[PDB]
Write a protein that binds this ligand. Structure first.
Ligand SMILES: Nc1ncnc2c1ncn2[C@@H]1O[C@H](COP(=O)(O)OP(=O)(O)O)[C@@H](O)[C@H]1O
Ligand SMILES: Nc1ncnc2c1ncn2[C@@H]1O[C@H](COP(=O)(O)OP(=O)(O)O)[C@@H](O)[C@H]1O
Ligand SMILES: Nc1ncnc2c1ncn2[C@@H]1O[C@H](COP(=O)(O)OP(=O)(O)O)[C@@H](O)[C@H]1O
Ligand SMILES: [Mg+2]
Lengths: 456, 147, 73, 57, 456, 74, 456, 74
């Protein structure tokens, strides 16, 4: 039995159904003439349900008939999804015809049990000096790239996609959640021209889209990755911006009749993250390695959204506007960035002591900032003067020219092994390069290139 | 030579809110009769706190620091009574019984700041309403400079 | 990472065995005093024996309080 | 040569203390902008809490 | 048909009217048997309107009859208003009897349309050397006046009031927004003693009046100025303090229960400023130029009130305590004062070069004064010593005797043309008067008078 | 060669909030027909201030700097 | 006649009564078949009253019958209360059986009249150097120990109880408002073992108890002290945390239908505090000497609760987290702490000059401390170098080992008289100890102990 | 020698709110029988966030940082 629209306010729509035929929560509904899809969110009583529209509400009116589909939003899964682009509802948006799926899965699912969790510490080399040094990654783990606007989350994620695809032969899933439509077109043509497209499934719900699409598109991409994991494969899951999923919930929370929490966020902020984040995990059947870009509002790392996200990750990479302002890229902060893999029992004592030594020197240089600004380096002790000179060389040596960034400067990209990374920083800490000028370490791939640059 | 009006910490907020107006009314008796008076309001900040309580319990809409929209009007209505009136005003008020004499009411309102913060809502209002300000400093008081 | 100046135990010596109770007496406040003295005397030209001795002891006790994870004593 | 070097030392110190005085002025200016931003945010948060609590009562 | 008071909460009064006779927004209402006037702010439905009382509500009761006037608050306009003091409603507050007006206008109207804009940018010659050279006023512009107390603010207003009336055949209006009764009385006598009272209309909205009175006084003075503009004149509108207009809006908005914005200001902050400021312009018939005193909360120029006000100002005049100590009047700072018309495309290259030349010499003299104070006059070269001599002559030539200051200065007042101003400063900068002593330039109308004074 | 869309400082906040979308629609006429166009929004920060006013008058819960939750979507 | 429970939300319970039998404000009600008491806070109209529970709500249900007792909460008073432990309702919480009461008093009462107020100024020696020097107490006055978490309020109060209450000839009352259950038990055994318990009545409301208990324990303890004062006796009244009375009000305020004030505190904060503080006073009949520990949220003395509390006290002792962070105890701030007794006519010129001399030296050192951290001690003048050494010695001589703190310090406790205190500070100020090392004055007792420690 | 009580991020806010009390009751079994036990609460800050969510959804009036008045008593 069909229901009728009784109220419309923005993206939220109330529908009245017979008391004996009320649709369940998360059930998909369809407006009869317009074919707009709605997802039930709450049961208000007296046969009324509150729902969010999965499209534009412009032109809808009170009294229109609505049909219930008997199930949640379901999307195509498996091999048929590779090399194709899909929207939040699972429709093809690449003009390449209909998808040939053998089955469809509902986008709402429970997280894998405690007994299904997989334990693993196998090191993943990224080829990026700062990441391989202070915050190493592990296969089947979760990585977060935290940063404000314009600091480098996409450039760093594109370089990681380029470098990790060298040693990974399995499938990949890329979920574009609330980001630029141009970035989706650029990435699609880059993979189509490189002949890599047939190994990747693409899901897009960009900035132009209504709140309902930006709120569920992350579940659609994750549902595809869970099919491959459950088939016993090792899959890569990339999320263009996880903060947009949270923001879409904030845009709709007041319309759903909820009281606001701190700084206007939804009262369900932590639960909404937990329900999504626990599904992005490796299990005894197969593994999911995931990289997520995390936006930081007004550069404030204490904001409830970034603050609630740290607890869900294995490796935390924090980008900084201050470091980017000095012309140092990738712009990772070595004192705020960290990883559970930075353990002597996982990486060995040599790598561990080198990373610890780099953090000690940078912390001590940070404490001297105000003294140096008022009186200069000449009033420091001879021990502090030696440490400041090494800190300045370490900061420059952490910089690296990326292959995806070659368009911005013309400088060739560089790939650096972990062996070469440890050797370079260890040599600088021990004083083997105390005679080289600090400008010799800027934008050089390996320590040998710093030695050659010093001869100019 | 002094009238003392008291509204203690245990008295109803209405009495604490009204006390400055009662004392002002007793002081105005001399001004209107061609005489001079001086009035001290030991804490206009405590009068504002009492009015905020009444306003919130009466469910009136709150503003900055939870004060009602009329907190500036509360102090302005009180402080404009303190004034010097001309000989014609005194002659008119007394029906010619007092002639050729002016009358006045001088006010010395007191405000308490938190850690030297003069930018708080109530202090900002009273600073703008008054003819001048005597600022007392904690650093000077500790340095032996008692006034 | 224990900040000895801000950290405190309200039960004190009653929660300790006699040997550690006698040997650790006053260490917490001594490290707190060393933090202030080491900052105050950072740019001093010369210092008395009491100050030199307090700084030398404070540095050694600061170094002694470091320990590795999963390595209990 | 020793006496003239002492006159040069005091002249170099005059310039150094002038520059130290000027650099302190920049630090005070940067901190004042951060303070004013924090002052405005505190008032806005308090009003959000007052309005939020009053709407529930 | 009349209505009845149904609710009274402080200054906010709700009145119930017959369904076919509900008064319009901003319509003025009269309580029967009392002098209380109410202004309609909102229509609540069921024939009930919410209004703000234009006076004390003490002694009012529920059920009193209320009469609709059929229009907004209407005030007296024209020559009959000059030399009289009035309240927000246009009633005379002096004991000089009733105003003899021949016409009345409502205080609410739209700003002059896009097609009514005068067009070409024309300067308003003030006759004051420092203002006309360093911070020129455009006809129809808004000028921000900054400084403390006891620095000549009243004397500057009285001189501007004299010059627009005697030299340009214009008129002035003074709007006392949140006026102190003691200062309002003192100012009225100072203008009477200076013979400028018959050239200005006074509107006072005293501090002890309800929020609605303080908020509407600016519109009352502006309505009186609009009548004089339509007579084909150039008018000066003085606003005692533009910050108090902003606060009165915050108080009224809080009384009406609107949700507060950033820093607690009313949500309508930018629109309320725009409604006032957009009427002050140059039109095809004549112009209204405004001088507004500005207060900065907590010395924070980024606070919403100063930041919203600065978007409308065309010039900034800064009065200085240090300049007043040197006996130089008016005490205007040539380096801190600014003007948007100080552009070679607006005022021409000759005026611009002369003004920038004076500012460069005064700026360099400020620096040399610190060298003279720390190291002594023997450190300066012959070029620096010549520059110091010219800076002293320029600094004294900026001083001027005012017709309203003859009591303080003794000497007769002077009106200086823009042509005479540019020629005088250009000649001093070129060194044409380097043979005259610095004391010859102090308190003289033009460069000619300085040449004649040097022979005494 | 230019279309000028105006919503001055005294016009209703509804028109100030809507002016960019009207100008954008007039500029899109050329894009959709295979032509090139250029658009200047003289102050998007003034558009955000106009949208904050409407949202607060509708009593919608505010966020950082009192702006609406949907100020990014705007 | 009996009423019925209609609603239960947290600690707040609504009860409906017949319209001719509605209970009075503050009247005590008893729930049938359950060991719970309710205190009426408001009359909502239509026969409904709002109340707070004085026991756990886990056994309550809607529809339970409630009996009106006809009076406010009444507690036992007089000689029978000495050497006993009681709850908020006056029940014995020790295992010594029923209290041998002969009279019961209601906990709600009006403050003494203006004509009943006392005027005593007899000085009270405490044996603590800082307190006896800058914060001298007086018999029948009010003392407040202000401080954040962990700065020493309980340890300072326990030393004051040892040095004042053990030797006192009259009765004592201790009110444990929102205190740790461990502190209450430790104090009971210490009073019992010391044979002092027979002079003390103990009333406790730990922080595990419902808001109603924590909101009224202060009144129960004060009611017992008022009975002894009105008998014409001299009484000691100790309160471990007066802030807990305020906090219990904040926990329940919003559920009582009250809009929140600044910092989220109840609008009635100042009145609730004044109604309690005006009863804790000395009168023409008898005297109450009281010491109240005052918690300071996040160490901020500007918070509304501490800020409102200062005006109610004669002696204000401020404990500073910055001083405690240096390992210096009792941690009393000599510049923020003060007493109404610090007057030459009350303590003589020698003590007054010594106290002001110490404050002058410490205030001058505070502004030199930041200079030494940037330029070093050698860059200061001859007078500053000498003054800094004396300030650092005075700062250490203010420290003292307490008998109640031997468990923390390991060293034995010291009692120092007022004359010994004055002589020690006069000697350090006059330069009699310029040759002793800075470390000789830390944790010693009288001045001779510093001379002896220097040789070791 | 250890009992592990888990209330992970995807579990109901009611379970996250109750987990500390459940672990405490399991630890009290030893205390009441003359034995010694040790209990670790992973994050009391996360339990407070779970209680704030339940309280706001039940429409109880909020205080500082939107937490309910009784968060101290919790
Ligand atoms: N190595 C680099 N060289 C130049 N620009 C870089 C580099 N790394 C990052 N960036 C900058 O990063 C920005 C894009 O990242 P960001 O805006 O944070 O990501 P997103 O697209 O997710 O918003 C661009 O401004 C780009 O110039
Ligand atoms: N042009 C002037 N010539 C001489 N003295 C002046 C002049 N302008 C101002 N002053 C002096 O400054 C005093 C205060 O000026 P006023 O305009 O009333 O400043 P304010 O209103 O801020 O108090 C005058 O009484 C007079 O002594
Ligand atoms: N006089 C003292 N001597 C030594 N330690 C002290 C002293 N006073 C306080 N302490 C320290 O602080 C703690 C006591 O603080 P406490 O009395 O519980 O303060 P509060 O009740 O204000 O939080 C002790 O555990 C001890 O470490
Ligand atoms: Mg305590």
């Amino acid at each position: 039995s069909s229901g009728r629209i009784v109220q419309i306010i923005g993206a939220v729509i109330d529908v009245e159904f017979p008391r004996d035929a009320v649709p369940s929560i998360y059930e998909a509904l369809k407006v009869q003439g317009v074919e707009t899809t709605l997802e039930v969110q709450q049961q208000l009583g007296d046969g009324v349900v509150r729902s969010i529209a999965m499209g534009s509400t412009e032109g809808l009116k009170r009294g229109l008939n609505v049909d219930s589909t008997g199930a949640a939003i379901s999307v195509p899964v498996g091999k048929a999804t590779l090399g194709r682009i899909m929207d939040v509802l699972g429709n093809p948006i690449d003009e390449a015809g209909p998808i040939g799926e053998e089955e469809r899965w509902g986008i709402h699912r429970e997280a894998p049990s405690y007994a299904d969790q997989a334990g693993g510490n196998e090191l993943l080399e990224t080829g990026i000096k700062v990441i391989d040094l202070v915050c190493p990654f592990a296969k089947g783990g979760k990585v977060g790239l935290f940063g404000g606007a314009g600091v480098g989350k996409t450039v760093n994620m594109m370089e990681l996609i380029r470098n990790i695809a060298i040693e990974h032969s399995g499938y990949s899933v890329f979920a574009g959640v609330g980001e630029r439509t141009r970035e989706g077109n650029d990435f699609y043509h880059e993979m189509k021209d490189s002949n890599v497209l047939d190994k990747v499934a693409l899901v897009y719900g960009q900035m132009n889209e209504p709140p309902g699409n930006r709120l569920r598109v992350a579940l659609t991409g994750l549902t595809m990755a869970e099919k491959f994991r459950d088939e016993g494969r090792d899959v890569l899951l990339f999320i263009d911006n996880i903060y947009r999923y949270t923001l879409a919930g904030t845009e709709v929370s007041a319309l759903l009749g909820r009281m606001p929490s701190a700084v206007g966020y939804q009262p369900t902020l932590a639960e909404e993250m937990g329900v999504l984040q626990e599904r992005i995990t490796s299990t005894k059947k197969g593994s999911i390695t995931s990289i997520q870009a995390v936006y930081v509002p007004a550069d404030d790392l204490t904001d409830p959204s970034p603050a609630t996200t740290f607890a869900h990750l294995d490796a935390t990479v924090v980008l900084s506007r201050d470091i980017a302002s000095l012309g140092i890229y990738p712009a990772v902060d070595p004192l705020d960035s960290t990883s559970r893999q930075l353990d002597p029992l996982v990486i060995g004592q040599d790598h561990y002591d080198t990373a610890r030594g780099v953090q000690y020197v940078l912390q001590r240089y940070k404490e001297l900032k105000d003294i140096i600004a008022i009186l200069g380096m000449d009033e420091l002790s001879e021990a502090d003067k030696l440490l400041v000179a090494r800190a300045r060389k370490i900061q420059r040596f952490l910089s690296q020219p990326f292959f995806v960034a070659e368009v911005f400067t013309g400088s060739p990209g560089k790939y650096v092994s972990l062996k070469d990374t440890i050797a370079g920083f260890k040599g600088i800490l021990n004083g083997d390069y105390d005679h080289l000028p600090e400008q010799a370490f800027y934008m050089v791939g390996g320590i040998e290139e710093a030695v050659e640059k010093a001869k100019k | 030579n002094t009238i003392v009006v008291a509204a203690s910490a245990s008295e109803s907020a209405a009495l604490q809110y009204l006390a400055p107006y009662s004392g002002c009314t007793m002081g105005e008796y001399f001004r209107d009769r061609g005489e001079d008076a001086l009035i001290v309001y030991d804490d206009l900040s405590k009068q504002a706190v009492a009015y905020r309580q009444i306003s919130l319990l009466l469910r009136r809409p709150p503003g900055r620091e939870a004060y009602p929209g009329d907190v500036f009007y509360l102090h302005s209505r009180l402080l404009e009574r303190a004034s010097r009136v001309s000989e014609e005003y005194v002659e008119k008020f007394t029906n010619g019984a007092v002639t050729g004499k002016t009358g006045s009411l001088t006010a010395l309102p007191i405000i308490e700041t938190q850690a030297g913060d003069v930018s708080a809502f109530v202090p900002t209002n009273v600073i703008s309403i008054t003819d001048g300000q005597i600022f007392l400093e904690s650093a000077m008081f500790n340095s032996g400079i008692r006034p | 990472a224990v900040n000895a100046g801000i950290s405190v135990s309200r039960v004190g010596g009653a929660a300790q065995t006699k040997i550690i109770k006698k040997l650790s007496g006053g260490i917490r406040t001594a490290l707190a005093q060393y933090r202030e003295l080491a900052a105050f005397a950072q740019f001093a030209s010369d210092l008395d024996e009491a100050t030199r001795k307090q700084l030398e002891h404070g540095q050694r006790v600061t170094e002694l309080m470091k320990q590795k994870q999963y390595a209990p004593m | 040569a020793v006496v003239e070097n002492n006159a040069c030392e005091q002249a170099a110190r005059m310039i150094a203390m002038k520059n130290a005085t000027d650099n302190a002025g920049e630090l005070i200016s940067d901190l004042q902008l951060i303070y004013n931003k924090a002052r405005q945010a505190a008032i806005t948060q308090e009003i959000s809490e007052i309005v939020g609590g009053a709407a529930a009562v």
